[PDB]
Amino acid sequence: PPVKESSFVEKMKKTGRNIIVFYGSQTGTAEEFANRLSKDAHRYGMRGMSADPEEYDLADLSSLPEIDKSLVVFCMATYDPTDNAQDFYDWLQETDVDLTGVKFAVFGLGNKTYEHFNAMGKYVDQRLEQLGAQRIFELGLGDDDGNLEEDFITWREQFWPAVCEFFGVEARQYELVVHEDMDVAKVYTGEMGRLKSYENQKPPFDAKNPFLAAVTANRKLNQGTERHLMHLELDISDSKIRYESGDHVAVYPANDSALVNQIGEILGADLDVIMSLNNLDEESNKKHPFPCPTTYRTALTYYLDITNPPRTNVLYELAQYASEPSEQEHLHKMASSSGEGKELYLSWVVEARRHILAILQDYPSLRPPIDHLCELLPRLQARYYSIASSSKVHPNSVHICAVAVEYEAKSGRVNKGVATSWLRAKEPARALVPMFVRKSQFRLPFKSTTPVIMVGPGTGIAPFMGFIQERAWLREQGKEVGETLLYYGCRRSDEDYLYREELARFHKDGALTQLNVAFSREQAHKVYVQHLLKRDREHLWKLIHEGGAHIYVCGDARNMAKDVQNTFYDIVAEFGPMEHTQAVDYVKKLMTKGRYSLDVWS
Ligand SMILES: Cc1cc2nc3c(=O)[nH]c(=O)nc-3n(C[C@H](O)[C@H](O)[C@H](O)COP(=O)(O)OP(=O)(O)OC[C@H]3O[C@@H](n4cnc5c(N)ncnc54)[C@H](O)[C@@H]3O)c2cc1C
Ligand SMILES: Cc1cc2nc3c(=O)[nH]c(=O)nc-3n(C[C@H](O)[C@H](O)[C@H](O)COP(=O)(O)O)c2cc1C
Ligand SMILES: Nc1ncnc2c1ncn2[C@@H]1O[C@H](CO)[C@@H](O)[C@H]1OP(=O)(O)O
């Protein structure tokens, strides 16, 4: 609950703004979009502004009409609503205001693999119209399972024309300030929010004031040499942090130092030059791109993203810094909605997975001002992990189960995951991992006697390591505990069976009523967790139909989770009986009555 700003409508007036793009974002992408769309109003002889719907009172849309040819755009992501867009939502639900005269557009960001695709967008664009506002352009539906960037360049290309036409209008966001005389303790060195907040830890710890927790355990859980699966233990003592199994822990990592050095090396400049990028819109909340003042090196290490494929809007803006014509032209055509330009971007940048440095190496004429480059780079996001311990057993420690990312890219070089390569490097002593916890609704039943069915192959194991530590603990405390079954899976039982001993011990003490593992490569056919579910179908239908058991799914969202959902569709279709459609509805209903929970990630 923060303090609202002044009515945005009034703000727009005082700065001559006629377009306000609102972004609902969780990992920046919706926001990045709203800002791109914002600076876009300029080329079209208009001026706009991005704004966090949380910091404003959306009831003020009703007053927007009072600005000339005013326009409001909504870039909303689904996670329904993201944290910052919750107010708006509850408002869009309670309010009954008459938005007659409001003109809007909406570009939603989602992922098709999800149950409720772009639910937020579909909702916003469909509720504004319910209130009296008129849609100016079609609802954009972004799919991060294909290419969101392309869906966005495709919408934005048909948007602006429809806008300029409708309004009859004819067809460095931040500024740089180098620091010569700066006091040493007044310089951010990587902390996230308040200055020196990292060094002087002061509760309560959240996303803006992360608690640097000490890595007390680092271990490799697998026997092979191909992959590196690891178990870490972060110590949250004196942090005053509460958590339950199912919850997630989030961490702010550090980029690889040499990938950082080499970036200032090729651009031929120093990273230690202390600076600041002050938003040219002196009245805007977001006064800076990241914590300023600070040195390039710091920003490149802690606040910027230097490994993900650059977006089309960044390449276009960097086109002007490449001498050689051929190159300049290539960077320029990366933002096409079709053609050889849309094809080089998807294969040479995306598919190839070339980070910012790579492109600078493969296009040597590109030597941009490191100043305009930092303003273009996206902020470094924190990475989530499903806490792997019960707080009833480890109140003062948060466990993480993860696989390290390192692969060969067509780009020609070996890429490394930012968070994983970093946590990998951290071992118990000087090792501090900046963190905080985010509550989720993946939870053990309210009643201990309620049955539980956990399905989670590979890393999807980790939340369940908690559910089991808790289920077991409840029994020791004399509580009466219903069935507790795990459906895990790995390649081979002597190669990457995670927590084999702990899971054996738990089965032994009777915590785990059933330990069903699936060894995928131990035979000709692939044997996956869903094969076991189909196997134990008769008994699983019993729990579901007569036991009121909860179902859980964790790990790969891409396929594993769909395959398991489909096998649950079949178990019901058979013992219902039912026809796959009535079984789907049955399984989905289980999802709304909170008896089927998902924790899948791509
Ligand atoms: C809510 C949620 C829960 C999660 N829970 C856990 C969990 O508990 N345990 C866990 O291990 N992970 C989990 N993750 C994943 C985790 O957050 C990170 O995505 C993961 O650790 C990699 O992050 P990184 O910074 O190391 O790599 P990044 O720098 O973020 O790179 C990730 C990207 O690299 C690319 N990439 C990965 N491998 C290849 C390849 N071989 N070939 C081509 N592309 C590839 C993909 O674009 C991938 O998205 C979860 C993610 C979310 C969103
Ligand atoms: C935990 C989690 C849950 C998600 N749930 C949904 C969902 O229900 N529907 C959907 O369309 N996309 C869903 N997504 C995908 C995001 O909407 C998509 O990646 C979006 O681009 C993120 O935008 P942001 O960076 O602006 O938050 C989810 C992603 C994560 C990580
Ligand atoms: N589609 C899927 N459904 C269920 N498990 C899968 C899966 N795809 C891969 N797996 C298995 O998930 C486990 C953890 O990664 C591995 O045993 C892997 O086996 P595989 O690698 O032989 O396909």
In three-state form (DSSP H/G/I as H, E/B as E, the rest C), the secondary structure along 264-309 is: HHHCCCCCCCEEEEEECCCCCCCCCCCCCCEEHHHHHHHHECCCCC
Range of the domain at 364: 254-379
Q: Is the dihedral of CA 338, 339, 342, 347 positive or negative?
A: positive
Rounded to 5°, the CA angle 118-120-126 comes to 100
Do 482 and 513 contact (CB within 8 A), yes or no? no
Phi, psi of 74, rounded to the nearest 5 degrees: -120, 115
Both 136 and 219 in a single domain? no
Q: How far is the CA of 364 from the centre of ligand 1 (A)?
A: 30
Both 400 and 343 in a single domain? no
- Decide which of 379, 401, 428 is a domain's last residue: 379
CA distance 102 to 71: 7
CA 416 to chain centre: 18
Q: Ligand 2 in contact with 30 (CB < 6 A)?
A: yes
Both 458 and 574 in a single domain? yes
CA distance 583 to 576: 8
DSSP state of 5: -
Closest to 533 (Cα-Cα) out of 546, 547, 545, 551: 551
* Token pair for 11: 């703000």
CA distance 56 to 140: 24
Do 444 and 475 contact (CB within 8 A), yes or no? no
Do 78 and 125 contact (CB within 8 A), yes or no? no
Active-site residue, 386 included:
yes
**151: Cβ contacts below 8 Å, ≥ 6 apart:** 140, 141, 142, 143
192 in a structural domain: no
CA distance 419 to 429: 20
185 in a structural domain: no
Helix or strand run (H / E) with residue 175? strand 174-178
* Token pair for 35: 């800002």
Identify how many contiguous H helices and E strands the chain contains and give both numbers: 19, 22
The domain spanning residue 368 has which CATH number?
1.20.990.10
Both 16 and 158 in a single domain? yes
CA distance 500 to 472: 16
Q: How far is the CA of 419 from the centre of ligand 1 (A)?
A: 8
Residue 73: strand pairing partners: 21, 105
- Rounded to whole angstroms, the maximal C-alpha distance in the chain is 77
Both 139 and 153 in a single domain? yes
Identify the residues whose C-beta falls under 6 Å from ligand 3.
457-458, 489-491, 520-521, 526, 528-530, 559-560, 563
Annotated active-site residue in 245, 386, 390, 421: 386
The domain spanning residue 416 has which CATH number?
2.40.30.10
Closest to 38 (Cα-Cα) out of 110, 289, 46, 519: 46
Q: How far is the CA of 518 from the centre of ligand 3 (A)?
A: 9
In terms of DSSP bridges, do strands 103-110 and 140-143 run parallel, antiparallel, or are they unpaired?
Answer: parallel
Q: Ligand 2 in contact with 35 (CB < 6 A)?
A: no
* Token pair for 373: 């480059």
Ligand 1 atom index nearest CA of 422: 26
Phi, psi of 47, rounded to the nearest 5 degrees: -135, 135
Identify the residues whose C-beta falls under 6 Å from ligand 1.
248, 307, 383-386, 401-403, 405, 407, 417-420, 459, 462, 601
Residues annotated in the binding site for FAD, as ranges? 353, 383-386, 401-403, 407, 417-420, 601
Residue 58: strand pairing partners: none
Residue 230: strand pairing partners: 220, 402
Question: Which protein residue's CA is at the shortest distance from atom 17 of ligand 3?
Answer: 490
Closest to 273 (Cα-Cα) out of 367, 182, 205: 182
> Which value, in Å, is the radius of gyration of the alpha carbons in the chain?
26
DSSP state of 67: S
In terms of DSSP bridges, do strands 484-490 and 414-416 run parallel, antiparallel, or are they unpaired?
Answer: unpaired
DSSP state of 310: P
Both 406 and 270 in a single domain? no
- Decide which of 415, 442, 469 is a domain's last residue: 442
**DSSP track, 347-359:** IIIIITT--HHHH
Q: Ligand 2 in contact with 379 (CB < 6 A)?
A: no
* Token pair for 79: 């996670």
Both 209 and 325 in a single domain? no
178 in a structural domain: no
The domain spanning residue 461 has which CATH number?
3.40.50.80
Question: Which protein residue's CA is at the shortest distance from atom 8 of ligand 3?
Answer: 560
Residue 232: strand pairing partners: 218, 400
CA atoms within 13 A on the CB side of 441: 10
Both 211 and 118 in a single domain? no
CA distance 141 to 522: 42
* Token pair for 384: 């989530």
Do 141 and 110 contact (CB within 8 A), yes or no? yes
Closest to 450 (Cα-Cα) out of 498, 422, 409, 482: 482
Both 13 and 133 in a single domain? yes
Question: Which protein residue's CA is at the shortest distance from atom 21 of ligand 3?
Answer: 491
Do 398 and 213 contact (CB within 8 A), yes or no? yes
Do 199 and 187 contact (CB within 8 A), yes or no? no
Grouping H, G, I as helix, E, B as strand and the rest as coil, residue 340 is helix
Q: How far is the CA of 114 from the centre of ligand 3 (A)?
A: 19
187 in a structural domain: no
Annotated active-site residue in 52, 496, 556, 599: 599
CA distance 508 to 500: 12
Annotated active-site residue in 371, 554, 556, 597: 554
Phi, psi of 599, rounded to the nearest 5 degrees: -145, 60
- Decide which of 171, 191, 219 is a domain's last residue: 171
Do 434 and 206 contact (CB within 8 A), yes or no? no
Q: How far is the CA of 533 from the centre of ligand 1 (A)?
A: 27
529 in a structural domain: yes
CA distance 160 to 157: 6
CA distance 192 to 208: 6
The domain spanning residue 93 has which CATH number?
3.40.50.360
In terms of DSSP bridges, do strands 383-386 and 248-251 run parallel, antiparallel, or are they unpaired?
Answer: antiparallel
Q: Which ligand sits nearest to residue 27's alpha carbon? A: 2
Do 533 and 571 contact (CB within 8 A), yes or no? yes
Do 346 and 268 contact (CB within 8 A), yes or no? no
370 in a structural domain: yes
Residue 599: strand pairing partners: 554
How many independent structural domains does the chain possess? 4
Residue 595: strand pairing partners: none
CA distance 369 to 457: 47
Both 594 and 463 in a single domain? yes
**Rounded to 10 degrees, what is the CA torsion of 485, 383, 600, 121?**
140
Helix or strand run (H / E) with residue 598? strand 596-601
CA distance 530 to 538: 14
CA distance 10 to 17: 10
CA distance 152 to 141: 9
The neighbour count for residue 476, using CB atoms within 10 Å, is 9
180 in a structural domain: no
Both 232 and 263 in a single domain? no
97 in a structural domain: yes
Residue to mutate (ligand 3; options 461, 556, 563; most atoms within 8 A of CB): 556
Enter the resolution in angstroms. Answer: 2.5
CA distance 467 to 478: 17
Closest to 447 (Cα-Cα) out of 476, 471, 468, 472: 471
Both 392 and 433 in a single domain? yes
Active-site residue, 292 included:
no
- Using CA atoms, how far residue 470 sits from 8, 83, 86, 500, in Å, is 48, 29, 32, 18
Do 553 and 561 contact (CB within 8 A), yes or no? yes
User: Which amino acid is residue 291, in one-letter code?
Assistant: P
* Token pair for 486: 């795990």
Ligand 3 atom index nearest CA of 460: 14
CA distance 297 to 274: 9
Q: How far is the CA of 90 from the centre of ligand 1 (A)?
A: 32
Q: Where are the alpha helices (DSSP H) in 186-236?
A: none
